[PDB]
Write a new protein. Structure first.
Ligand code: URA
Ligand code: SF4
Length: 206
């Protein structure tokens, strides 16, 4: 089922990342440039999970390198968290996208629950490998990947969650995806940014 047979029996992140380059666990590997595995080391206490690599990440081979990543770095710095000490990854490892005539970018398309479930074996391997004390779930797709398809990020802000089917029973904190804070009225973006910093500080205080 899904990516399971493509996941080797190793906690070495470099070996896992190389194996993910060969994954065919769903259809998304076909049009994407490459798999984008997580970045960071196994000593990380905090794991952060986004939805999927976007246009820039698909070509950089690294997560959170575009505008959403720059806002996330501003929030991490405000929360006094060193990005270099985190393990940062995504629920889905291949960019799902389309282009619009006249567009300046490839446009993300939402992964189906089917694709998230197919890719989840990689997240389980990452979590088993890193043994984080806390997992920050950035956005609906990531949070639902671990907390259920009905989970609503908007309803659980600031909350330390724990579920029974997650490796090592880490604390889970679900928050807004940084891409949500890039657009909207200034006051709304500023309030939302403060809330993201708050949630990052809850996770770091675990
Ligand atoms: O790595 C990335 C970049 C943008 N958005 C995500 O969810 N993940
Ligand atoms: S998105 Fe995940 S499950 Fe699908 S092919 Fe890529 S690595 Fe495999």
């Amino acid at each position: 089922a899904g990516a399971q047979d493509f996941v080797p029996h190793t906690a070495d992140l470099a070996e896992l990342a190389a194996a993910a380059g060969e994954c065919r666990g769903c259809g998304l590997y076909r049009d994407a440039t490459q798999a984008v595995f997580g970045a960071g080391g196994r000593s990380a206490r905090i794991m952060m999970i986004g939805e999927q690599p976007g246009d820039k990440e698909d070509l950089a081979g690294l997560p959170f390198v575009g505008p959403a990543g720059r806002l996330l770095d501003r929030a991490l710095e405000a929360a006094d968290i060193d990005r270099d000490a985190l393990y940062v990854t995504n629920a889905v490892k291949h960019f799902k996208f389309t282009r619009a005539a006249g567009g300046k970018r490839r446009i993300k398309k939402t992964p189906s629950r089917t694709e998230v479930v197919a890719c989840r074996p990689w997240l389980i391997a990452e979590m088993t490998s890193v043994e984080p004390d806390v997992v920050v779930l950035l956005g609906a797709t990531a949070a639902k990947a671990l907390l259920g398809n009905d989970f609503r990020v908007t309803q659980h802000r600031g909350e330390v969650l724990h579920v029974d089917d997650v490796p090592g029973d880490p604390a889970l904190v679900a928050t807004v995806h940084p891409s949500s804070l890039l657009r909207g009225p200034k006051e709304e973006r500023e309030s939302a940014f403060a809330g993201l910093v708050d949630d990052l500080r809850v996770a770091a205080d675990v």
